[PDB]
Amino acid sequence: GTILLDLAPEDKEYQSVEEEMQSTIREHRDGGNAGGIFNRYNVIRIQKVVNKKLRERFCHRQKEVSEENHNHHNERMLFHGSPFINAIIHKGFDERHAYIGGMFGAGIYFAENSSKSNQYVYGIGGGTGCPTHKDRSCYICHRQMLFCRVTLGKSFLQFSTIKMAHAPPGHHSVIGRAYAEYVIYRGEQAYPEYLITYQIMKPE
Numbered sequence: 001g002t003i004l005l006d007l008a009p010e011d012k013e014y015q016s017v018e019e020e021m022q023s024t025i026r027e028h029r030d031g032g033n034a035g036g037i038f039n040r041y042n043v044i045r046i047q048k049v050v051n052k053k054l055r056e057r058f059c060h061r062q063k064e065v066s067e068e069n070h071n072h073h074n075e076r077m078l079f080h081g082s083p084f085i086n087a088i089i090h091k092g093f094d095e096r097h098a099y100i101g102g103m104f105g106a107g108i109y110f111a112e113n114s115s116k117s118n119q120y121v122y123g124i125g126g127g128t129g130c131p132t133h134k135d136r137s138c139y140i141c142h143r144q145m146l147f148c149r150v151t152l153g154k155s156f157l158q159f160s161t162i163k164m165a166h167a168p169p170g171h172h173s174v175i176g177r178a179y180a181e182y183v184i185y186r187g188e189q190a191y192p193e194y195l196i197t198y199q200i201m202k203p204e
């Protein structure tokens with residue numbers, strides 16, 4: 001099944017992913033309620049997910065999208081957080097477990113900003129936080145999030161909240177607008193490329 005490759009801190013690839021993660025921390029409108037308070041992550045581990053069934057399904061989808069998007073994937077690296085990352089890296093994304101409460105409909109959601117996704121690591125609104133301390137801003141418990149290859153194909157820009165079950169005709173994804181949220185409606189338009197294990201760090 002799924003094989004995890006551990007990246008070394010010396011690898012440029014490691015240093016790019018951590019750079020994307022550290023440099024996209026923002027202040028969120030809920031004052032850090034869901035995701036905690038921090039200016040930095042402490043990155044513990046970065047692992048590359050290798051799964052043959054999933055790579056195959058991703059590629060397949062990727063080709064269909066290319067055809068309808070002038071032979072462009074429009075692939076982006078985006079974050080995703082969920083308390084079921086473990087099911088994700090073994091069975092892929094599953095739109096049947098879509099974010100029912102999502103602003104732009106029932107799809108699978110991704111962020112440019114790591115701090116956005118981190119808000120969903122323990123559940124929606126941050127849930128009741130970590131299992132041990134029930135603390136959404138815990139600094140001890142290890143969190144995991146995904147930095148994913150996401151096939152956006154042709155994106156539809158939505159500036160209003162609106163329940164969508166699927167992308168608009170001729171489109172493969174929705175970009176919704178504070179900051180943009182990227183939504184896909186098919187699980188195979190995302191591959192969980194990097195599994196990041198980390199902590200949020202208490203500001204000094």
Ligand SMILES: CC(C)(C)c1ccc(C(=O)Nc2nnc3n2CCS3)cc1
Nearest residue numbers: 079080081082099109110111117120123
């Ligand atoms: C399994 C349950 C708890 C239903 C679930 C529901 C929604 C999400 C999710 O959408 N997470 C996420 N990661 N990055 C972003 N988001 C949404 C904003 S941008 C993850 C898990």
Ligand SMILES: [Zn+2]
Nearest residue numbers: 130133138141
């Ligand atoms: Zn904890």
